[PDB]
Structures are given as structure tokens and as C-alpha cells.
Design a protein around this ligand. Structure first.
Ligand code: VO4
Length: 149
């Protein structure tokens, strides 16, 4: 297994950005990637995933900002579809683990119905530092309200 990934359930993991040297490595373990990094900060083309048969969702979230609730719902629904196909999914951003950690917490809320408090604790247990900003926490609160309703 690619030990940089941490799984929040049987099928969904989050990690730092794999480098071009690691692409075959994570393609062996994952069939789908959620790429949160902005186009201009990529060090290889995302066609690298396509030539390996890996499905790509490119939904960039700028450095130190939170996704909108709509953006997050779109990401979650796509992850859901891939998991239902039997695929393992890797969420990643470049640099810290604020943005990828936010999507990982949202996935636990969305798929397992965990309240935000427990989902946050879980992901932070996996990677201390996940969910870095007040804005990221606030969109997770907005998600929780959406789901409860
Ligand atoms: O720029 V971050 O993914 O550490 O919020």
C-alpha cells in the first residue's frame, strides 16, 4: 500500500499530492482521485492519471480557503458514485492537509452520518492538522445543517 494515504473508511483515503514518481504506485491501490490542487501548481499533467486508467475529479480549492457548500456537495456525490462502482478513492491537495482533510471530514458526515464533532476528531486522529482554517470549519457546519435537513 501507498503508506502516505490514510483511510477514513474501507474505500476513501486522503493524502499529500503524489509526485510523478509515485503515480503507478497510487494507481495500483486507487481507481479514482479527487485532485484539489490548482492547475498551475501541478508538476505533471492530470492526463497522467487517464493514461493509467484512473478516474479524475479536478475540483481545485485555492490555498488556505474553503470550498463552497455546493462545491463540497459535488465532490461528495462524485466520491459516492465511484465508491458504488467498487473503486477506492484518494483525495489530495498540495502542501498541508487543510483542504483534503476538510473533504475527508465531509465524507464521513455525508456517507456515515457522523456528527461534525466526531468526524473532525476521527480525521484529526489520522493526521493532526486536518481542517486548518475557520472557513473550512464553517463550511462543514453548513454541510451538517444541510444534511440534518
Ligand atoms: O493551503 V491548506 O490545504 O494546508 O488549507
Amino acid at each position: 500500500m501507498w503508506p502516505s494515504a490514510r483511510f477514513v473508511d474501507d474505500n476513501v483515503a486522503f493524502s499529500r499530492m503524489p509526485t510523478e514518481r509515485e503515480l503507478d504506485e497510487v494507481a495500483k491501490d486507487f481507481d479514482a482521485v479527487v485532485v484539489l490542487v490548482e492547475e498551475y501548481e501541478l508538476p505533471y499533467s492530470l492526463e497522467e492519471w487517464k493514461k493509467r486508467g484512473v478516474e479524475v475529479l479536478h475540483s481545485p480549492i485555492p490555498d488556505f480557503t474553503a470550498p463552497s457548500l455546493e462545491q463540497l456537495l459535488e465532490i461528495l456525490r462524485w466520491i459516492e458514485a465511484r465508491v458504488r462502482e467498487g473503486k477506492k478513492v484518494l483525495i489530495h491537495c498540495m502542501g498541508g492537509l487543510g483542504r483534503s482533510g476538510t473533504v475527508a471530514v465531509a465524507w464521513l458526515m455525508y456517507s456515515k452520518g457522523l456528527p461534525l464533532r466526531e468526524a473532525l476528531r476521527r480525521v484529526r486522529s489520522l493526521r493532526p492538522g486536518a481542517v486548518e482554517t475557520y472557513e473550512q470549519m464553517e463550511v462543514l457546519k453548513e454541510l451538517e445543517k444541510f444534511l440534518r435537513s
